[PDB]
């Protein structure tokens, strides 16, 4: 963008909503592209601060959610902490 | 990047795997940024073609998934078809 920003909670109500809408679409667009390019299944669940639900699924949410419950074994799991740490040790 | 690509299945297996790993991180990084910048809760579930499971959650997966089961109310719902539609119309 016009400037680099810090990854910190935006307190201005209007910028938060504008950014939320913009980046949520960006995020879904990238999920679309990833599912198609690499033939993967992807479900994405977002609750905004107002606790409203937004959802995306490459094909169908319930198939993915079903696939998830039947998954017994060890997987890869990441959270914001893991992502931040990985970025720190990119330098 | 060096050449623009069309969004269609990559047939070369090894470029597909390289692209999966790089773009998977890209997606998770964008989710992290959206989650902190706009103070929202995000969960992400990925099954690759080999049906291996990859998951991301802003805070705790089980927490987010559970709240999802309690929320049935009318919300936004998108699929690849919807995105492809919005891209046509943009």
């Amino acid at each position: 963008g016009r400037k680099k920003i810090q990854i910190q909670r935006i307190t201005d109500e209007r910028n938060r909503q504008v950014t939320f809408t913009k980046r949520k679409f960006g995020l879904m667009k990238k999920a679309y592209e990833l599912s198609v390019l690499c033939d993967c299944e992807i479900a994405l669940i977002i609750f905004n601060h107002s606790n409203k639900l937004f959802q995306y699924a490459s094909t169908d949410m319930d198939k993915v959610l079903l696939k998830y419950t039947e998954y017994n074994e060890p997987h890869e799991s990441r959270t914001n902490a893991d992502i931040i740490e990985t970025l720190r040790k990119k330098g | 990047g060096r050449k623009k690509i069309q969004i269609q299945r990559i047939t070369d297996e090894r470029n597909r795997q390289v692209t999966f790993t790089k773009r998977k991180f890209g997606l998770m990084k964008k989710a992290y940024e959206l989650s902190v910048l706009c103070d929202c809760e995000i969960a992400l579930i990925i099954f690759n073609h080999s049906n291996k499971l990859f998951q991301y959650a802003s805070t705790d997966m089980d927490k987010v998934l559970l709240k999802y089961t309690e929320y049935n109310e009318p919300h936004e719902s998108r699929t690849n078809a919807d995105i492809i539609e919005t891209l046509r119309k943009k």
């Binding site: 319930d62 959610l65 079903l66 | 089980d62 998934l65 559970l66 999802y68 089961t69 049935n72």
Partner: peptide
């Protein structure tokens, strides 16, 4: 598979752990 039926199935599976 209802939408509420997979959610309600998801609910069990979580609480079961």
């Amino acid at each position: 598979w209802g939408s509420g039926e997979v959610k309600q199935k998801l609910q069990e599976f979580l609480l079961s752990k």
